[PDB]
Write a protein that binds this ligand. Structure first.
Ligand SMILES: Nc1ncnc2c1ncn2[C@H]1C[C@H](O)[C@@H](COP(=O)(O)NP(=O)(O)OP(=O)(O)O)O1
Ligand SMILES: [Mg+2]
Ligand SMILES: [Mg+2]
Ligand SMILES: [Mg+2]
Length: 431
DNA sequence: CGGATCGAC
DNA sequence: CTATGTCGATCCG
C-alpha cells in the first residue's frame, strides 16, 4: 500500500466511531491553540523582536562558548524488537508481515508489515484492513525482558554507567573506553563467530563490535548512533535503521552540516503537536528553528525556547546521569463497558490492591492519590487528592480513591458513568 | 496542589 | 466486536 491509499483505508475504517469523534475534538483544540498563537504573533512589534534578538543572541553565545565535543556518546536501539524476537523463535513468521499485539492494540510491527503502514500504537483490526495477510502474535513480555538483559550485559563492558532508557534502547558514554582501547592488543578486541575476527580502535569500530556481539548472543540486530551528545546520537541511530549505524564526527562543522536540513520532528522531544505548531510559523528544519529564535522567545516559555535553541545549535547532554528515583506509580485497565456503580467501586478497590502490591515491592509510600476515568466516548478525567501523612496499603489508597469516585458518580446522577477504563496513581513520594 | 497535555517506547 | 499501559515534564489556574 502507498502513502495515499493507507490514509484512505484508515479514514474509511475509523469514520463515525466514538474514538474518531474524540480525535476530531482533540484536533480542534490544537488548531485553536495555534490560532491563539497567531493572534499573539500579529501583535508583536519589530521593536520587541529586536530587543528579543539581542537577548537570545547573548544566550546563544553563552551556549556556543560551552559547547563540548570531547565525549563520544553512543545510542543503541534494537530493530523491530518484539517482532524480531518472535520471528527469531518461529521461522514460519520470517519473510512474512507480522505485528506483536492484539486486535485492540499493536506494540510494534516488523519492517515487512511497516511497508503496508501498520505500526506501533495502531489497533490490530485497522492493521488487518491495511494488510489481511498480517499475522498478529501475542506479546511474551518476560522473554523480551530476558533478551534485554542479554544486551545490557554486553553494553556494560563499554560503559558501566550506561543509561538504559527502555528494554530495547540505551545511551553509552564510551569516552573512557575509547581512550583505554587505543593501547589494546588484538586479543582484547577479538571475538569468535557462533574462525575468529577483530575490531579496530575507532568509535565506528567499537559500535560494530557491540552490534556484532549482540547479534551473536541474541540472534537479533540493533541500530546505533555516534555523536558528541545524546540528542544527536539518538537521531543518528534512527538514520540507518534497521541494522546500521551513523557517526557525526566531533567537529563543529559536521554537527552543523547534519543539523542544517534536519526536520525538527526527528528530534526526541518534538512530537506531532509541536511539529504542527512550529510548521504554522514556517518552521520545519533546524536552521529555520535557529532563524526564528527571537520570535520563539516571545511566543513560547523560557524552558521551551531554551530547549529549541539547544536543538538549533545541535547541542545536548554530554554526560549521563544515574537513573533518578521514580516520582509516581500507577495502574490502569481498559475493559468492556462498566456502568453499575457497585462494579465501579469494586474495580477501583481491585486497582488499589494491585497498586499497593506494586508499591510494596519497591517499599514506596505517597501522599497524593489520583484516579483516572475514561468514558465510552474516550473523554478522560483525572481527580486527585493529597493527604498529610504518606499512605501505601490497599485500604488507605482505596479510602481516598473511593471518595474521588463517589464525587464523580454523584456529579452525573441520575445518569450512570459509562466507563471503558479506570486507573489509580500514587505520587508525592518523600525525599 | 489539581487537572490537562505532550512525548516517549 | 475492536483505539494500550505507563511515567516524567510542562503549563496553567
Ligand atoms: N506505543 C507503544 N505501546 C506499547 N509498546 C510499545 C509502543 N511502542 C513501542 N513499544 C514496544 C515494542 C517495541 O518493539 C519496543 C521498542 O520500541 P521502538 O524501539 O520504538 N520500536 P521497535 O524496536 O519495535 O522498532 P524500530 O526501533 O526498529 O523502529 O517497545
Ligand atoms: Mg527499536
Ligand atoms: Mg527505542
Ligand atoms: Mg520526535
Amino acid at each position: 500500500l502507498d502513502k495515499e491509499k493507507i490514509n484512505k483505508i484508515i479514514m474509511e475504517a475509523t469514520k463515525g466511531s466514538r474514538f474518531y469523534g474524540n480525535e476530531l475534538k482533540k484536533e480542534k483544540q490544537v488548531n485553536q491553540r495555534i490560532e491563539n498563537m497567531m493572534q499573539q504573533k500579529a501583535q508583536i512589534t519589530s521593536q520587541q523582536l529586536r530587543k528579543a534578538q539581542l537577548q537570545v543572541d547573548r544566550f546563544a553565545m553563552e551556549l556556543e562558548q560551552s559547547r563540548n565535543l570531547s565525549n563520544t556518546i553512543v545510542h543503541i536501539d534494537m530493530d523491530a524488537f518484539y517482532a524480531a524476537v518472535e520471528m527469531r523463535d518461529n521461522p514460519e513468521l520470517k519473510d512474512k508481515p507480522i505485528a506483536v499485539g492484539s486486535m485492540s492494540m499493536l506494540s510494534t510491527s516488523n519492517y515487512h508489515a511497516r511497508r503496508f503502514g501498520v505500526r506501533a500504537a495502531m489497533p490490530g483490526f485497522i492493521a488487518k484492513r491495511l494488510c489481511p495477510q498480517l499475522i498478529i502474535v501475542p506479546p511474551n513480555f518476560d522473554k523480551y525482558r530476558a533478551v534485554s538483559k542479554e544486551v545490557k550485559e554486553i553494553l556494560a563492558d563499554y560503559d558501566p554507567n550506561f543509561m538504559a532508557m527502555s528494554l530495547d534502547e540505551a545511551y553509552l558514554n564510551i569516552t573512557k573506553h575509547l581512550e583505554e582501547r587505543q593501547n589494546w592488543p588484538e586479543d582484547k578486541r577479538r571475538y569468535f563467530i557462533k574462525n575468529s575476527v577483530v575490531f579496530g580502535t575507532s568509535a565506528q569500530e567499537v559500535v560494530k563490535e557491540i552490534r556484532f556481539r549482540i547479534e551473536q548472543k541474541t540472534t537479533l540486530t540493533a541500530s546505533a548512533g555516534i555523536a558528541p551528545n545524546t540528542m544527536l546520537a539518538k537521531v543518528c541511530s534512527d538514520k540507518n535503521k534497521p541494522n546500521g549505524q551513523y557517526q557525526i564526527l566531533p567537529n563543529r562543522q559536521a554537527v552543523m552540516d547534519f543539523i542544517k536540513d534536519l526536520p525538527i520532528r526527528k528530534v526526541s522531544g518534538i512530537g506531532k503537536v509541536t511539529e504542527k505548531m512550529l510548521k504554522a510559523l514556517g518552521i520545519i528544519t533546524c536552521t529555520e528553528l535557529y532563524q526564528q529564535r527571537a520570535l520563539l522567545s516571545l511566543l513560547f516559555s523560557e524552558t521551551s525556547w531554551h530547549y529549541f535553541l539547544h536543538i538549533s545549535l545541535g547541542l545536548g547532554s554530554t554526560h549521563l546521569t544515574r537513573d533518578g528515583e521514580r516520582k509516581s506509580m500507577s495502574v490502569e485497565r481498559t475493559f468492556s463497558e462498566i456502568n453499575k456503580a457497585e462494579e465501579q467501586y469494586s474495580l477501583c478497590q481491585e486497582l488499589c490492591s494491585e497498586l499497593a502490591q506494586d508499591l510494596q515491592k519497591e517499599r514506596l509510600k505517597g501522599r497524593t492519590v489520583t484516579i483516572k476515568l475514561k468514558n465510552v466516548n474516550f473523554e478522560v478525567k483525572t481527580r486527585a487528592s493529597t493527604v498529610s501523612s504518606v499512605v501505601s496499603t490497599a485500604e488507605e489508597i482505596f479510602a481516598i480513591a473511593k471518595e474521588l469516585l463517589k464525587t464523580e458518580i454523584d456529579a452525573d446522577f441520575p445518569h450512570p458513568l459509562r466507563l471503558r477504563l479506570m486507573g489509580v496513581r500514587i505520587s508525592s513520594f518523600p525525599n
